[PDB]
Design a protein around this ligand. Structure first.
Ligand SMILES: CCCCCCCCCCCCCCCCCC(=O)OC[C@H](COP(=O)([O-])OCC(O)COP(=O)([O-])OC[C@@H](COC(=O)CCCCCCCCCCCCCCCCC)OC(=O)CCCCCCCCCCCCCCCCC)OC(=O)CCCCCCCCCCCCCCCCC
Ligand SMILES: CCCCCCCCCCCCCCCCCC(=O)OC[C@H](COP(=O)([O-])OCC(O)COP(=O)([O-])OC[C@@H](COC(=O)CCCCCCCCCCCCCCCCC)OC(=O)CCCCCCCCCCCCCCCCC)OC(=O)CCCCCCCCCCCCCCCCC
Ligand SMILES: CCCCCCCCCCCCCCCCC[C@@H](O)O[C@H](CO[C@H](O)CCCCCCCCCCCCCCC)COP(=O)(O)OCC[N+](C)(C)C
Ligand SMILES: CCCCCCCCCCCCCCCCC[C@@H](O)O[C@H](CO[C@H](O)CCCCCCCCCCCCCCC)COP(=O)(O)OCC[N+](C)(C)C
Ligand SMILES: CCCCCCCC/C=C\CCCCCCCC(=O)OC[C@H](COP(=O)(O)OCCN)OC(=O)CCCCCCC/C=C\CCCCCCCC
Ligand SMILES: CCCCCCCC/C=C\CCCCCCCC(=O)O[C@H](COC(=O)CCCCCCC/C=C/CCCCCCCC)COP(=O)(O)OCCN
Ligand SMILES: Nc1ncnc2c1ncn2[C@@H]1O[C@H](COP(=O)(O)OP(=O)(O)O)[C@@H](O)[C@H]1O
Lengths: 140, 320, 107, 42, 459, 54, 98, 48, 347
């Protein structure tokens, strides 16, 4: 639900590194669990044990991605002393992308991940700053 | 009013046109047999309609004028070249076989349309059934490859799974030495080159793979050369037998409506004869296809629809 | 392997046809000499004679809708007036400051 | 196949076209006059 | 404006009702007549514009482009007459129909009072070119080339539609006159930055900007001669015209936004000029030269000064004419040799002297020899860039030197040396090809007598 | 000519886009046609809508 | 909204989940559909009777009739599938695939 | 001197069950040309 | 089947759709859906074979589940408010259940899995009917209650449908599955504007229906269901291939074709409501549909594929039956962009 979003967003950007990391870990774990549920439903690989192994692997990968992103972004915001700057989200986002590359153990996915997650995180920060709506209400 | 759903709704029922005489009949015999004479005789005595055996240019006789078209515009194959060089490198043998099978399919559709539209029966030579005997002989003699017979089997299945088998099959049996003597007496120089192995393989295929299979769903009259000379006994056997084992008694008015819609619209009849499977004997390149199609379009009465050709002499074009 | 080593029935690649062989003085427009010659004539006439010459002359003698000599005369009369009256030629302000209401800062 | 110009269908087509054109012109004239009457132009 | 549009539309029924052996003559004659009508538009005023109606206007920026577009069609027909000899009448009529539709779309694009109409026609030009490339193309890579050409353009231009509808929702109008008169500054904001990017990238991808120029060599090499002519002459200038029209609302954001694109173009002209030095294909070399010229035009438009705009307009016209002539010469060689490789046919000056003269004049014009309008635009843009920054002169000089180098390399490799011995099918040049080259080259030397006609609205 | 233009510029936009789209197409279209998995996914989807959008 | 309505809604949810599982035996799928319509009948009847809305006493009958007609249609389809393959197993319907 | 046109080898790319064949889908076969698949009387012993 | 029975069944399908469209009572809408489902199955199973039976049973299962969910939503709405009229839904839970049921009926993602297989199993005429007429009733019901829909869920399933259609159309060689994925993508486009304007939804529905009718009628005319079978059409009837290529270009949203109208208007309307990101993603994703349309056009008309010898007989025969309105549908799906402001008629 939106409870995880509220718990993550209520924390200030430049403080409480551990709280932000924990919230990011929870969000990543939820996303990984949903992806694992879809993967199990659409593709039952061989058995119950291999399926739960797949679920655990996906969940841990997503949770690690979220934790690294949150920790790196919050530390960058704290150290640089310039909050509300998309560069911090860029750096943290593709620290998470590099951790994805390390987990999957291939350099190309790591570089692609840094590109396409740093840009995504910077875009999200820009949208928060400028008030962009993804799901706009019907104004007119 | 062309036949369709509206005609079936209002008045058109073809079950009332059946008068126990329809009885589609097919006559099968080995090369240079007396079957053509025998088939013709049966048609005249029973009052049915005779269908001469379909050749390379059978389809040419039913569209436009009855005159045949050029070989490169119709068939792209010749029987004389098959007799002269059965192992020709340009794949003429299987092209001939496939074109002849398609011609037989079109002729069978035409005969079925006539029978279902008028009620008058028809008499046919070698039909889509038993056309495989030439394929089997050609394969056993090494004239064609195995992929060719696989393609023939696929096309034959997909096409012939949609028609009713003949009521009565009439076979004239002639020994191979006698038929070779008849070939020698015929005088055709190209037909002289037929080997005895080819005829024996043909003959083996007819008895072994065709007679019992049609015995299980049709009525068979195996006849020899001497006893086929008199058609009176043949006709008497024709009326004496009653068909009660085939699918024909199981049909009704709705199945007849479906089959009548199928037999007309010949483009649907010939739909699966050009399946996109690429065998070098029958596949044609883009440039040659374009050139031949452009030449065909340049034929006098073939650029437009049959009634829209001023060059032939069609008038009132601007109001049709 | 009794395969014919032929993938399909294809026409051979045709050889390029020379326009000069069957018709010298070919002009490179068409294989039919009459249509060829008339195509050459119409192309040469309607391009060189009509467009390239008449349109060039038309563009050369276009009237001054861009108003160059008009600007020359206006500038000449203004400089005559200003030199004679002691005015210092061109003025730094394009608009008279009397008609601009600046906003008071009071900082 | 072998067909003569079907005069029944040609006649019906031409009659439908002419009837549609005349009805359209009459409708347009009525609309113009009734518009003028409502807004008091003429 | 309809006095040009209606005859172009009537070109279609005339073509489709022509005799089987009279399509080319009629099309050429009526296209030349249409071009003569277009000449009247050149008369322009120093004031606002030639506002014909609510839908169309003309300007001294649009007038030379319209004249070039109308003039190009007879040349394309002349070039296409040869290789379509063995084609059926219906398909030749379809080819002529594609060319006429492309001309009509370009003509309506260049007038286009309203920006959504401009976008609609600017995208409508994409279909006939794609059909020409992927239908009447010789090689098997024409399909991939057409896919690249379609998808680069569409990916670039899809955000432009969103930007335009947003701009109309906010401002209330997309008519260019109201946009110009009611212009307001853009605040330095992330939303404004992305709006600037969406407004700019669609025209950048079609210039082509360096790094986004991959589609151009494929499309130019795989297209038939008429397609190459139109792509090199007119279709590349659509991006420049759009940038010139749309940079009025991007101020003062453009002052710092332009740097990434300025650096890309300034280094990419050097890169593509150096690429031209090592090329085994004539068409690829000409395409990369086009890329260099259009990169320098991008620099001119981004600098956004009056001299920049005048130089950009002059260079656009001159490059269109020169690239069309070079492609035509390459096609004349190809139709004899059927190879499209520089090193195969050598020493053609001995066999074809007049065509060698045409080659020399085309290379000199591409080399920007004074007082050709190519050098007029080149020098105006160089001076404007020097005023922008004195350090640009190094890159501009390097580009000039490399340009002269590969132009004379292309001339010497094909025209000089010893003829290839085993090639014996090199027939004398036809009158059609010579007339094509003459009609390409004479307008350039006539326009250098009246440079004010191609210097744009800021003259 | 080679390293930048024919390799890396080609790798960045077009080849990457083609590879990603082809992989996503393979993932989406690789379904065995068993209604078991389809309606299991429908059940999973229905539960998510109830608990995540309200 | 008291506990009886919650129990009936829970029964409907259980029947829907059992339908969406598909261990095997399409007959069980039809059984789950009929359990769903039975739960719908019960809960709608309770709502209608509680509020004394006289004119909707028709609606449960209409629902029952239409759902039983749908049940007959599904049974016919199952019979045709079984005559095609010899069994009503779900996994035999894999000829058409995404 | 001739415009290239697709041949059998090129045309065979579009003849499979799906585009972009994979290991899992390698065994998939196209549907039959007509959408018909092959179809692939009890006794009673009334004794005493 | 008997032509009388077929006509009666088609009339029953149409009358069920009209009953859904004209009624104001929820029970009558449910009855219309049930009648349409009941009369739809024999139309799909008209040509009896195992594939059609499997498609029919899949369709029956999906539609029965959707109808049960819709009935449950109606009953919950009645429970929380004694109302039978189709208006504001009055309940958050009831609305969610109803939206999923209508999405399952329409085939929106993630409930899209049945559309490609049902389309592949049935013939081309049944596919035409299923992909054109069977969208009117659920879309009309969604339009009537558009003020109640949660925009987040509607937009999520719309974007999912667009992405799924774009990705799944890339992998197909069968024409019917291509048309099914195209239908899924177009449905996703249609439902992304319901929260903002229903007139745009109806305009998109009309344009898509015209284009789909043109495409299916062209495919029926040249009796091909695979890419390679359609690659043989140029050797007999090149005009059909050229018209098909123009229609495919129109279906890809390329201006100035008719298919550019719905996407243009939907983007403009969504931008009026301060929505920017979603139209950009939607156009980017529709690029994939355009790509596989271009692949089909390449295989069909822009190049000439090898032919077979037996086409010479087909050269001699003409189609016995000519489909009326095929010319009108092609023109309407190709050349109606200049008539865009006519959408104010509340089409
Ligand atoms: C706008 C929204 C549009 C929604 C989408 C359009 C729905 C299209 C389906 C229409 C019905 C099927 C159909 O017409 O085929 C498509 C048709 C192609 O037909 P076909 O594939 O050649 O026909 C083969 C039939 O499937 C083979 O059928 P048959 O030959 O067995 O049928 C016999 C025929 C002949 O009918 C009769 O004999 C009359 C008998 C009267 C019996 C009375 C019973 C009373 C109870 O009856 C019909 O064809 C159906 C008549 C239904 C009338 C409904 C009013 O093309 C179109 O319908 C496109 C029309 C354009 C859209 C609709 C009109 C414009 C708006
Ligand atoms: C300098 C003043 C000249 C006044 C005389 C008027 C000349 C009229 C020329 C009209 C334009 C030429 C058309 C181009 C194609 C040529 C046609 C042809 O095939 O000839 C066959 C014909 C018959 O010979 P053939 O034996 O049958 O053919 C055998 C082979 O073709 C073998 O033939 P080839 O080996 O003899 O070579 C062909 C020849 C012809 O091919 C060409 O390359 C000639 C075109 C060179 C220009 C290249 C573009 C560079 C930008 C210049 C743009 C300015 C144009 C001004 C307005 C032009 C109006 C149309 O190429 C050359 O001779 C080398 C040209 C290199 C000259 C570099 C100097 C250029 C800049 C000079 C400044 C110009 C303005 C001065 C401003 C300050 C003072 C007021 O030969 C000739 O008649 C040659 C043409 C005359 C030479 C022109 C050289 C300078 C004139 C340039 C334009 C006029 C300037 C106006 C100022 C007047 C004061
Ligand atoms: C081959 C061997 C030699 C034989 C020839 C010997 C003779 C030599 C002469 C050739 C050039 C010598 C230079 C002499 C120049 C004199 C002519 C000049 O003065 O006229 C120019 C005029 O030239 C035209 O302005 C330019 C030509 C028009 C170009 C348009 C191209 C035609 C359309 C074709 C399609 C367009 C394609 C490109 C799209 C833009 C400039 O005149 P300008 O001082 O100003 O004012 C004109 C007079 N006023 C004051 C009354 C107004
Ligand atoms: C691939 C071949 C070529 C294709 C075309 C390439 C051209 C596109 C490049 C886009 C131009 C620049 C984009 C934004 C420029 C604005 C300036 C900004 O970036 O600089 C600093 C911005 O700081 C940081 O850069 C923040 C952004 C960090 C995240 C961006 C990702 C960096 C690399 C991504 C490149 C990927 C390009 C290709 C995409 C597929 C200034 O600090 P700040 O004062 O705070 O911000 C000022 C702007 N304000 C006033 C609106 C707030
Ligand atoms: C989020 C979704 C974003 C949507 C992006 C849409 C991009 C538009 C093109 C999509 C094409 C993807 C499919 C594809 O190309 O597959 C690889 C394909 C496989 O060949 P097939 O024809 O399928 O099979 C042949 C053997 N039988 O390989 C190719 O042919 C590639 C040739 C086409 C290249 C096109 C270049 C497109 C990229 C240009 C840059 C911009 C792309 C668009 C998005 C950019 C990001 C803003
Ligand atoms: C050759 C391929 C090139 C493809 C194009 C690359 C650039 C694309 C441009 C960015 C995409 C979005 C364009 C924005 C549309 C204009 C609308 C606008 O400017 O309004 C902005 C909207 O701005 C945005 O929403 C932008 C969000 C971006 C989401 C899409 C990301 C696409 C990729 C972005 C990174 C790449 C951009 C450069 C690419 C470089 C070349 C490859 C403000 O919105 P409001 O909320 O109404 O006002 C704020 C005050 N309340
Ligand atoms: N399947 C076939 N393949 C090749 N040729 C065939 C085939 N079927 C019939 N023919 C040829 O058709 C001709 C007529 O057949 P046939 O019965 O032998 O002579 P007739 O019609 O005089 O009785 C013969 O020359 C025969 O070879």
């Amino acid at each position: 639900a939106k409870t995880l979003l509220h718990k993550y967003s209520d924390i200030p950007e430049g403080t409480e590194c551990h709280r932000k990391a924990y919230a990011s870990t929870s969000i990543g774990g939820a996303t990984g669990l949903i992806v694992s549920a879809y993967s199990i439903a659409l593709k039952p690989p061989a058995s119950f044990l291999e399926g739960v192994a797949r679920t655990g692997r996906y969940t841990f990968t997503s949770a690690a991605i979220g934790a690294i992103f949150g920790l790196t972004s919050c530390i960058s915001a704290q150290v640089r002393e310039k909050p509300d700057d998309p560069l911090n989200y860029f750096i943290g986002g593709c620290a998470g992308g590099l951790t994805l590359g390390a987990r999957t153990r291939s350099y190309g996915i790591g570089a692609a991940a840094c590109a396409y997650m740093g840009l995504t995180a910077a875009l999200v920060k820009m949208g928060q700053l400028e008030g962009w709506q993804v799901f706009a209400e019907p104004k007119v | 009013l062309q036949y369709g759903p509206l005609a079936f709704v209002l008045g058109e029922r073809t079950t009332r046109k059946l008068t126990e005489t329809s009885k589609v009949i097919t006559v099968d015999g080995n090369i240079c047999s007396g079957k053509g004479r025998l088939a013709r005789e049966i048609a005249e005595k029973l009052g049915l309609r005779h269908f001469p055996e379909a050749g390379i240019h059978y389809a040419d006789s039913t569209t436009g004028d009855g005159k045949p078209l050029d070989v490169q515009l119709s068939g792209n194959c010749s029987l004389e070249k098959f007799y002269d060089d059965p192992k020709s490198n340009d794949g003429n043998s299987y092209r001939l076989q496939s074109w002849l099978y398609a011609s037989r399919l079109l002729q069978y559709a035409d005969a079925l349309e006539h029978l279902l539209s008028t009620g008058q029966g028809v008499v046919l030579e070698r039909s889509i059934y038993s056309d495989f005997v030439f394929l089997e002989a050609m394969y056993r003699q090494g004239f064609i490859r195995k992929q060719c017979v696989e393609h023939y089997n696929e096309v034959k299945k997909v096409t012939a799974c949609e028609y009713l088998p003949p009521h009565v099959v009439v076979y004239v049996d002639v020994p191979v030495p006698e038929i070779q003597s008849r070939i020698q007496k015929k005088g055709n120089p190209h037909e002289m080159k037929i080997t005895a192995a080819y005829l024996q393989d043909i003959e083996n295929a007819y008895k072994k793979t065709f007679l019992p299979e049609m015995s299980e769903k049709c009525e068979v009259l195996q006849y020899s050369a001497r006893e086929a000379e008199d058609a009176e006994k043949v006709v008497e056997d024709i009326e004496y037998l009653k068909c009660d084992k085939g699918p024909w008694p199981d049909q009704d008015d709705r199945t007849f409506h479906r089959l009548r819609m199928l037999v007309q619209n010949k483009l649907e009849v010939l739909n699966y004869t050009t399946i996109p499977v690429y065998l070098p004997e029958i596949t044609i390149g883009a440039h040659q296809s374009d050139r031949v199609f452009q030449k065909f379009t340049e034929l006098p009465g073939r650029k437009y629809s049959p009634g829209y050709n001023e060059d032939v002499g069609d008038k009132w074009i601007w109001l049709k | 392997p009794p395969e014919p080593t032929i993938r399909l029935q294809e026409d051979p690649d045709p050889e390029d046809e020379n326009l000069y062989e069957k018709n010298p003085d070919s002009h490179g427009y068409d294989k039919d000499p009459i249509v060829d010659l008339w195509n050459m004539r119409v192309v040469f006439f309607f391009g060189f004679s009509i467009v390239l010459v008449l349109g060039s002359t038309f563009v050369a003698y276009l009237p001054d809708y861009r108003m160059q000599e008009w600007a020359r005369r206006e500038a000449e009369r203004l400089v005559k007036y200003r030199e004679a009256n002691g005015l210092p030629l061109m003025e730094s302000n394009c608009f008279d400051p009397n008609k601009i209401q600046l906003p008071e800062d009071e900082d | 196949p072998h067909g003569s110009p079907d005069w029944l269908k040609v006649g019906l087509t031409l009659g439908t076209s002419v009837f549609l054109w005349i009805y359209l012109i009459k409708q347009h004239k009525e609309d113009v006059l009734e518009y003028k009457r409502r807004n008091g132009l003429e | 404006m309809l006095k040009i549009i209606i005859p172009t539309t009537m070109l279609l029924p005339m073509t489709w009702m022509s005799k089987h052996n009279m399509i080319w003559i009629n099309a050429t004659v009526h296209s030349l007549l249409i071009s003569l009508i277009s000449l009247s538009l050149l008369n322009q005023l120093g004031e606002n514009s030639l506002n014909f109606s609510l839908t169309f206007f003309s300007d001294s920026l649009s007038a030379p482009l319209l004249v070039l577009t109308t003039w190009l069609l007879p040349l394309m027909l002349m070039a296409s007459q040869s290789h379509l000899s063995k084609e059926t009448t219906t398909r030749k009529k379809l080819y002529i129909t594609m060319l006429i539709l492309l001309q009509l779309f370009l003509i309506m694009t260049f007038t286009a009072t309203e920006l959504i109409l401009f976008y609609i026609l600017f995208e409508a030009t994409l279909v006939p070119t794609l059909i020409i490339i992927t239908r009447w193309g010789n090689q098997t890579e024409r399909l991939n080339a057409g896919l690249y050409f379609l998808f680069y353009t569409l990916a670039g231009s899809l955000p432009l539609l969103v930007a335009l509808v947003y701009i109309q929702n906010t401002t209330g109008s997309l008519n260019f006159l109201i946009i110009h008169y009611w212009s307001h500054p853009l605040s330095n904001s992330w939303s404004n930055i992305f709006m600037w990017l969406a407004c700019i990238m669609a025209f950048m991808v079609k210039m082509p900007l360096y790094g986004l120029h991959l589609w151009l060599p494929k499309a130019h090499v795989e297209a038939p001669i008429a397609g190459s002519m139109v792509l090199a002459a007119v279709l590349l200038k659509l991006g420049g015209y759009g940038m010139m029209r749309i940079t009025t609302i991007l101020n003062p954001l453009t002052n710092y936004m332009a740097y990434p694109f300025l650096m890309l173009s300034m280094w990419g002209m050097i890169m593509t000029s150096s690429i031209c030095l090592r090329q085994t294909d004539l068409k690829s070399l000409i395409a990369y030269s086009s890329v260099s010229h259009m990169a320098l035009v991008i620099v001119a438009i981004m600098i956004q000064t009056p001299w920049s705009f005048m130089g950009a307009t002059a260079l656009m016209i001159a490059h269109g004419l020169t690239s069309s002539m070079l492609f035509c010469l390459a096609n004349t060689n190809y139709e004899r040799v059927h190879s499209r490789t520089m090193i195969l046919a050598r020493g053609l000056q001995t066999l074809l002297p007049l065509m060698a003269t045409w080659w020399l004049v085309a290379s000199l014009t591409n080399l920007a020899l004074p007082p050709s309008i190519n050098l007029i635009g080149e020098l105006f843009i160089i001076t404007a860039s020097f005023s922008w920054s004195n350090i640009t002169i190094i890159l501009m000089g390097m580009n000039m030197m490399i340009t002269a180098l590969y132009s004379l390399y292309m001339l010497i490799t094909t025209q000089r040396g010893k003829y290839t011995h085993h090639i014996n099918n090199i027939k004398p040049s036809f009158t059609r090809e010579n007339a094509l080259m003459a009609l390409h080259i004479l307008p350039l030397l006539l326009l250098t007598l009246n440079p004010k006609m191609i210097l744009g609205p800021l003259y | 000519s080679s390293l930048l233009d024919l390799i890396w510029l080609e790798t960045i936009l077009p080849k990457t886009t083609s590879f990603i789209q082809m992989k996503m197409s393979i993932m989406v279209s690789n379904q065995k046609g068993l209604i078991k998995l389809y309606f299991l996914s429908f059940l999973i989807t229905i539960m998510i809508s109830m608990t995540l959008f309200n | 909204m008291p506990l009886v309505y919650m129990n009936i809604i829970m029964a409907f949810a259980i029947a829907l989940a059992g339908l969406l599982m598909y261990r095997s035996h399409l007959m069980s799928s039809l059984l789950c559909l009929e359990g769903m319509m039975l739960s719908l009948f019960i809960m709608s009847t309770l709502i209608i009777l509680n509020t004394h809305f006289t004119l909707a006493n028709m609606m449960p009958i209409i629902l029952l009739v239409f759902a039983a007609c749908e049940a007959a249609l599904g049974l016919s389809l199952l019979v045709m599938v079984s005559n095609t393959y010899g069994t009503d197993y779900v996994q035999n319907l894999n000829l058409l695939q995404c | 001197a001739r415009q290239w046109q697709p041949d059998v080898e090129w045309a065979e790319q579009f003849g499979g069950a799906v585009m972009y064949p994979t290991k899992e889908t390698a065994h998939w076969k196209p549907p039959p040309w007509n959408d018909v698949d092959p179809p692939k009387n009890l006794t009673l012993n009334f004794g005493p | 089947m008997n032509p009388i029975i077929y006509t009666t069944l088609i009339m029953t399908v149409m009358s069920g759709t009209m009953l859904v469209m004209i009624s104001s009572h929820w029970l009558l809408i449910w009855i219309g859906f049930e009648m349409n489902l009941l009369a739809m199955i024999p139309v799909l199973m008209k040509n009896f074979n195992p594939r059609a039976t499997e498609a029919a049973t899949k369709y029956f299962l999906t539609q029965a589940t959707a109808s049960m969910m819709l009935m449950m939503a109606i009953i919950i709405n009645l429970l929380y408010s004694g109302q039978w009229t189709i208006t504001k839904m009055f309940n958050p839970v009831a609305m969610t259940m109803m939206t999923m049921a209508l999405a399952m009926k329409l085939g929106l993602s993630p409930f899209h899995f049945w559309v490609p297989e049902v389309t592949q199993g049935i013939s081309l005429q049944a596919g035409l009917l299923l992909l054109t007429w069977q969208k009117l009733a659920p879309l009309s019901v969604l339009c009537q209650i558009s003020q109640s829909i949660n925009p987040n869920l509607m937009l999520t399933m719309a974007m999912l449908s667009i992405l799924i259609g774009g990705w799944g159309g890339l992998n197909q060689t069968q024409l019917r599955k291509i048309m099914a994925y195209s239908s899924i993508a177009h449905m996703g486009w249609m439902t992304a504007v319901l929260p903002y304007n229903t007139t745009m939804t109806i305009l998109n529905l009309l344009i898509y229906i015209t284009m789909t009718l043109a495409m299916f009628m062209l495919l029926i005319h040249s009796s091909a269901t695979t890419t390679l079978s359609l690659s043989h059409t140029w050797n007999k009837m090149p005009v059909i291939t050229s018209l098909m290529m123009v229609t495919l270009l129109s279906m890809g949203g390329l201006p100035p074709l008719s298919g550019f109208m719905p996407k243009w208007m939907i983007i403009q309307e969504m931008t009026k409501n301060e929505s920017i990101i979603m139209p950009t993603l939607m156009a980017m994703t529709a690029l994939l549909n355009l790509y596989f349309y271009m692949r089909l056009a390449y295989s069909s008309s822009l190049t000439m594929f090898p032919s077979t010898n037996n086409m010479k007989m087909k050269w001699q025969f003409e189609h016995t039956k000519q489909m009326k309105l095929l010319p009108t549908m092609i023109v309407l799906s190709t050349l109606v962009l200049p008539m865009t402001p006519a959408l104010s008629s509340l089409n």
